[PDB]
Write a protein that binds this DNA or RNA. Structure first.
Lengths: 159, 159
DNA sequence: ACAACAGAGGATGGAGCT
DNA sequence: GCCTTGCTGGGACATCTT
DNA sequence: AGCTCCATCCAGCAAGGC
DNA sequence: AAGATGTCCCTCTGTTGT
C-alpha cells in the first residue's frame, strides 16, 4: 500500500506515502565531484541506498519516478545529467527490490489542474502544501521546488 | 596493497558488457542485458536494470567487491540523445552496483587503454585466451572493453 | 534477418480526432 | 554565509609547456 | 493504425539580494 | 599554477553484405 514518488534531478526529492500514517519527504542526498575544471553537484548513490533501506519498506513497493525528457534547446550536459539521475534512481530502486513505474512530468497536471498560463512560479510548491498540510513548513522557500514535485508524483501514483 | 578479491569491469553503454575475474579461476564475460523500449516514434535498446541485478546476484560476490566502470565522456559533436544515453547507462550501472553492495570505481576510458579500438579485441583475446572464441566478431568490442577494464582494475592497488 | 558499415548528432509524451 | 533571480544551453582528461 | 496539435522540463554558471 | 594541445568515446538511422 506504500507509495513512493521521486524527482530524479540533482536537486530533487523523495516522497513517502505510508497508508494510515503521516506523509514524509526527503531532499535527495548529493555530493561534490570534480568534472574537468570545476566541481559539479551529483546524486550520492550511497546515501540514497541508506535512505531507502531506512524506510524498512515492504518488498515490491511501487515507486513512481518522473521521466527525464529535456528540451532540444537544452545543452548536452543537461541531457547527460537528465539521463544520469534518471538511470541512477531506476538502478538503485530496481536493485533494492522496489517496483518502478516511470511517469511523465505532465502527468500530475491531469488530476491537479495546471497550465502554461498561470505558470507554476509557486503553484506547484503550494498545491503540494495544500495536499500535505503536515509538510507546509518545508515548502515556504522557493528552493523547495523538488520537494513539492516528489510529493505530487507520489500523490499521482496513490490515486 | 594488491587486490586479492574479485575484480569486475563494466562497459556501461547500451551494447556494453561486464567481465568477472575470479582469482585463479576461468574469467567470464556477459553481454549487458538490454530490452527494446518505445520512445517517441521509434524503438531503441536500453539497459535492462531488472536483468542486470539478476545477473549480479547470480554471482553471489563478496560485499564490497571492487567494480571498475568506464566513465561516460561524450564529445560535444555528439547529439543530445548520445549525451542522455551516456549518462543513463552510466548512472544506472553505478546505482545498481552501489545498491547491490559493490564498491564502484569510475575509471576514465583513456586510463585502461593507456595501460596496454580496432585492435582492442585482439589485445583482450590474447590476454584471455579462453574467451577468444567470443572475440571473433568486431561487435564484441564491448566484451573486450569490460575485460580490459577489469584487467586494469586488478592491477590497481586497494586498501 | 542479422552483421557490418557509413554518416551525422537527432525530443518526448499525451490527448484528440479520422 | 545561504537563497533568489536570471540566463544560455555549455567536454573531459591527460600531457605537455610555459 | 496513423496524424494532427499541445503540453512538459532541468543543468550550469554567472551576478545580486537577504 | 595555469595555458596549449591532442586523445578519447557513443547514439541513432540508414544502407549494404552477408
Amino acid at each position: 500500500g506504500w507509495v513512493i514518488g521521486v524527482a530524479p534531478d540533482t536537486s530533487g526529492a523523495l516522497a513517502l506515502l505510508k497508508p494510515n500514517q503521516p506523509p514524509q519527504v526527503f531532499d535527495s542526498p548529493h555530493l561534490k565531484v570534480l568534472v574537468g575544471k570545476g566541481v559539479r553537484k551529483r546524486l550520492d548513490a550511497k546515501a540514497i541506498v541508506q535512505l531507502l533501506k531506512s524506510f524498512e519498506a515492504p518488498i515490491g513497493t511501487t515507486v513512481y519516478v518522473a521521466q527525464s525528457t529535456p528540451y532540444p534547446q537544452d545543452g548536452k550536459q543537461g541531457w547527460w545529467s537528465g539521463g544520469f539521475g534518471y538511470g541512477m534512481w531506476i538502478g538503485i530502486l530496481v536493485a533494492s527490490g522496489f517496483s518502478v513505474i516511470p511517469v511523465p512530468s505532465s502527468a500530475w497536471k491531469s488530476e491537479f489542474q495546471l497550465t502554461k498560463e498561470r505558470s507554476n512560479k509557486d503553484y506547484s510548491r503550494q498545491v503540494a502544501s495544500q495536499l500535505f498540510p503536515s509538510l507546509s513548513s518545508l515548502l515556504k522557500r522557493k528552493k523547495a521546488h523538488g520537494r513539492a514535485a516528489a510529493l505530487l508524483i507520489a500523490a499521482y501514483g496513490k490515486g
